[PDB]
Amino acid sequence: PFARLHECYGQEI
Amino acid sequence: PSLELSRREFVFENVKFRQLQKEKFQISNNGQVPCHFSFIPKLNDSQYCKPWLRAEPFEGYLEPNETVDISLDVYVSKDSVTILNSGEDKIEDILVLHLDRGKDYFLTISGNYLPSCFGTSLEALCRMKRPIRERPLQVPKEIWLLVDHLFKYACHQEDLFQTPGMQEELQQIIDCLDTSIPETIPGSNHSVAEALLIFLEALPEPVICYELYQRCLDSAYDPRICRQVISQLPRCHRNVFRYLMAFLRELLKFSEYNSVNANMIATLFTSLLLRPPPSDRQRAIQFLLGFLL
């Protein structure tokens, strides 16, 4: 489930 | 005891984090007797210059009239990056070259520093949406970009986090992150991986804040209690810690390819994420391992 978190944290980038 | 100097004023233009500069000059004993020269601290200091500067050599003997080249070396390391980033210090200084039983020669150091996202706090980075030298982010875009690259290209990278990258590429990566939000980070996987480590190590405040450090160690053996210490961190620190733990667990899945095992991760990342201002080393790795497994 790393890809979900990473995608979210990439918001605004 | 007399010296002749090729020059006395030196300029260090566009100084960058971890990028070496050298300004060289020649000293020549123009006196009639042999002299001893050495750089000395200015009235009431410990050192003869600031940390980011060094003289090579800083002392010597000169017969009349042999010459010697002096290298004035500027290198902004993790010790100075934050104060120079902040403007609390400037690329300026005075070096006092001292003739044993004689004159003092004053060398003036000037120039300018270019701030880096490296050595900048997680909190300030999460508040800046554009590159430093072009609601807050959950994590700094720069750490996201590094992890993003590794996640995309390096999951199956042999010896990830065990092979050093290329110095040239490291600098390219840092400059890249200082000035852009790129589609691809330049450089090999090993370079990007090492840039990440350098980023964490350069943080003015570690991922796990200093004051929580000791509580982490004490709590090291109770997983419910470790997690709660983590809850005490500021939002951006908590997020970066969780983010990284999740990333490292992701890499552990590909261990058969990238050689990334729990041992290596523990010993490598513990000291980076959990710095103090022995066998505490053991409770530390234990603390981290608790999260990886």
Q: What angle do CA B50, B167, B111 make, to 5 degrees?
A: 35
| Residues making up chain A, counted from first to last | 13
Asked if A2 lies within 8 A of B151 by C-beta distance, the reply is yes
Residue of B nearest to A12 (CA): B137
Torsion over CA: B244, B246, B248, B251 (sign): negative
Tell me which residue of B152, B158, B182 sits closest to B250, measured CA to CA: B152
CATH ID of B139-293, from 3.30.360.10, 2.60.40.1080, 2.40.240.10, 1.10.555.10: 1.10.555.10
Question: Resolution in A for the shown PDB structure?
Answer: 2.3
Asked if residues B249 and A2 have their Cβ atoms less than 8 Å apart, the reply is yes
SS3 of residue B27 by DSSP: strand
Experimental method: X-ray
Report the run of H or E that residue B110 belongs to, with start and end.
strand B104-114
Residues of B in contact with A9 (CB under 8 A): 137-139, 144, 239, 243
Q: Where are the domains of chain B?
A: 1-127, 139-293
| Distance, CA of B30 to chain centre | 41
What are the distances in angstroms from CA B107 to CA B2, B16, B104? 16, 22, 10
Partnered with residue B23 across adjacent β-strands are B72
The superfamily in CATH containing domain B1-127 is: Immunoglobulins (2.60.40.10)
Name the strand (E) or helix (H) holding B67.
strand B67-74
B148 vs A contacts (CB less than 8 Å)? 6, 10
| Burial of B165 (C-beta count, 10 Å sphere; 0-12/13-18/19+) | buried
Q: Exposed, middle or buried, A11 (CB in 10 Å: 0-12/13-18/19+)? A: exposed
CA distance B130 to B141: 9
CA B152 to chain CA centroid, nearest Å: 26
Residue whose entry in the numeric block shows the structure tokens 């809850």: B231
d(CA B31, CA B53): 29
